[PDB]
């Protein structure tokens, strides 16, 4: 099983039609975790899409982009699709318009592209979860 933090090159880079399958388990003691779609592996690399479930405060998920080391306008959904201790299936479908986020078969969010998606080279995952597998399809 992959170890954390996980920071992996996406084969051939990100492209439309690709789906990222993440199987994991949310920690019994989960505060946060994130999945980042990252542009390169340099100090201060841009993050085209930051997906950040949070139990601090109102349980929620935060979505954003980091460009030039600055966070953009945050998007939020005040709903939590994960559960402490519970296994989950997290899927990112890459479409021309947005990343479509699906959690346990349910559509959860559509994040509109801010950085051109072909810039993304790496998937990065860290925080309060256990990773079982990550597969790239398409
Ligand atoms: O937006 C993603 C980014 O959020 C940072 O925290 C934000 C916080 O969500 C917001 O409510 C507050 O106004 O500004 C904070 C600083 O930008 C996190 O620090 C970072 O890890 C990302 O998750
Ligand atoms: Ca809470």
Numbering used by the authors: 14 to 151
What did the article's authors report about this structure?
The tandem-repeat galectins, of which galectin-4 is a member, contain two distinct CRDs at their N- and C-termini, connected by a variable-length linker region that is susceptible to proteolytic degradation. The overall fold of human galectin-4N is the conserved galectin β-sandwich fold comprising two β-sheets, F1–F5 and S1–S6, of which the concave side of the β-sandwich (S1–S6) contains the saccharide-binding site. To investigate the interaction between human galectin-4N and its natural saccharide ligands, we have determined the crystal structures of human galectin-4N in complex with glycerol (the cryoprotectant), lactose, lactose-3′-sulfate (3′SuL), and 2′-fucosyllactose (2′FL) at 1.70–2.00 Å resolution.
The galectin-4N-lactose complex structure was determined at 1.90 Å resolution from crystals grown in a PEG-based condition that is different to the other crystals reported here (which were crystallised in high concentration of sodium formate). The binding sites of all 4 monomers within the asymmetric unit contained unambiguous density for the lactose molecule. However, due to the presence of calcium acetate in the crystallisation condition of the galectin-4N-lactose complex, the four galectin-4N monomers each contained a bound Ca2+ ion, coordinated by the backbone carbonyls of Phe68 and Gly70, the carboxylate of Asp72 and 3 water molecules. The binding interactions observed between galectin-4N and lactose are the same as the conserved interactions observed in previously reported galectin-lactose complex structures. The C4′ hydroxyl of the galactose saccharide interacts with His63, Asn65 and Arg67. The C6′ hydroxyl of the galactose residue interacts with Asn77 and Glu87. The C3 hydroxyl of the glucose residue is in interaction distance of Arg67, Glu87 and Arg89. Additionally, the C2 hydroxyl of glucose is in hydrogen bonding distance of Arg89. Within the asymmetric unit, Arg89 interacts with lactose only in monomer A, but instead forms crystallographic salt bridges with Asp55 of other monomers in monomers B, C and D. As we observed in the interactions between the galectin-3 Arg186 (equivalent to galectin-4N Arg89) and other saccharide ligands, the galectin-4N Arg89 interaction with lactose and similar ligands may be transient. The presence of galectin-4N Arg89 which can form transient interactions with the lactose C2 and C3 hydroxyls could contribute to the slightly higher affinity, as the galectin-4C equivalent at this position is Lys261, which does not form similar interactions.
